[PDB]
């Protein structure tokens, strides 16, 4: 009920401490961390982030597409950690076979 999460921000590399029943973005606006957010409901790509060492729950997909759940992408505003996590925040995609 409190997992370790690592944020490889294009700024530095945070070492937060996000709980279970708490969205990640929320804990970022707590410790005083500044991460991108818009609708804050999980319908856009404002808070995208390629995950790594760990797993998170983002069932409130909405914008989470097909090979997005597999490619590792994560919508930080709508995802609770289910294990220690290491995400690369501020990550974006606007092409690649598009």
């Amino acid at each position: 009920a409190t997992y370790n999460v690592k944020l490889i921000t294009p700024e530095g590399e945070v070492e937060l401490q996000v709980p279970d029943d708490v969205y990640i973005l929320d804990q970022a606006e707590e410790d005083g961390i500044d991460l991108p957010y818009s609708c804050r409901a999980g319908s856009c790509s404002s808070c995208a982030g390629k995950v790594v060492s760990g797993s998170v729950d983002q069932s409130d997909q909405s914008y989470l597409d097909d090979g997005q759940i597999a490619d590792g992408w994560v919508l930080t505003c709508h995802a609770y950690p289910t294990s220690d996590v290491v995400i690369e925040t501020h990550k974006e995609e606007e092409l690649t076979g598009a």
Binding site: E30, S38, C39, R40, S43, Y63
Partner: protein, 296 residues
């Protein structure tokens, strides 16, 4: 819980996997033929099937597919119509869409896919909708609360919804009796959105409303500093700060992300002179749902 209204609230009645197919009833260009970038006010039909609330937003799925034979992803747009809509029948939903157009580093003029699919919609066309989406920008329950609305460009959208309910309407469960303050920053007067309307609101109840425009190009303050959405707030910085510490003052920001820096800048200097550093203070505001952002 929340100080914001969440009684008659709903989200995701429709998702990208099976959107509601509405139809364009109206679509008009609300910016002067000489403005930097056209914006359009458009009205779709919902058959009451999308009970969205002031502050929420809907998604649109443009037709066709991108240069890969794949359906376009959903693009979000703040709802510019109050719950009952611009028709009063709770049967429609309106959008304030800016049409995206720029030239790239190749000299090719590009066009945003959805915002262009929207500004070209011909009354009768189908439009795929999703939502309602969002709970962050909802309105407070307190009808006598102060409410600062900082907006830039199509960022006036959710506030135009706000205001329609605050004055142009009468409900037997809501009567705005506090102060509604709006700040709209745009580059030109030919770019002002719904001024007439905010003009009638400023009379329907000149005691509760207060609107301040910030035409960045045709306005300057002291040292000929361009009058920006935040430069306008500067001239009231004193009165403003004397509100940012009362349980009933709810600030709302929305629009072109970037208008958020300046605001914090004129806020840090003001706070970093009295109390703590603005930043940690915004954290205490967001505590009681008094600083809700939705920039994009």
């Amino acid at each position: 819980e929340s100080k914001k209204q969440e009684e008659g609230v709903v989200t995701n009645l429709y998702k990208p996997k099976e959107p509601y197919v509405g139809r364009c009833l109206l679509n008009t260009k609300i910016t002067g033929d000489d403005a930097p970038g056209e914006t359009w006010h458009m009205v779709f039909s919902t058959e009451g099937k999308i009970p969205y609330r002031e502050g929420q937003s809907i998604g649109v799925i443009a037709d066709g597919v991108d240069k890969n034979g794949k359906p376009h992803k959903v693009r979000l747009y703040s709802i510019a119509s109050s719950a009952i809509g611009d028709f009063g029948d709770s049967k429609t939903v309106s959008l304030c869409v800016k049409r995206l157009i720029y030239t790239n580093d190749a000299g090719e003029i590009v066009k945003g896919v959805c915002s262009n699919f929207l500004c070209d919609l011909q009354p009768g066309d189908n439009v795929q909708i999703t939502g309602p989406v969002g709970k962050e920008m909802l309105m407070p329950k307190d009808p006598n609360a102060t409410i600062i609305m900082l907006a830039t460009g199509t960022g006036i959208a959710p506030f135009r919804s706000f205001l329609w309910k605050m004055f142009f309407e009468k409900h037997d469960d809501y009567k705005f009796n506090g102060l509604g303050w709006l700040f709209l920053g745009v580059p030109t007067s030919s770019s002002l959105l719904y001024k007439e309307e905010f003009g009638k609101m400023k009379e329907r109840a000149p005691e509760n409303f207060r609107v301040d425009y910030a035409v960045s190009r045709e306005q300057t303050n002291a040292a000929g500093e361009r009058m920006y959405i935040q430069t306008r707030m500067a001239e009231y910085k004193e009165e403003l700060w004397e509100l940012l510490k009362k349980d009933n003052t709810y600030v709302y920001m929305c629009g072109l992300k970037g208008m958020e820096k300046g605001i914090d800048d004129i806020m840090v200097s003001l706070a970093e002179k009295d109390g703590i550093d603005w930043f940690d203070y915004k954290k205490q505001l967001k505590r009681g749902d008094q600083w809700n952002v939705e920039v994009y």
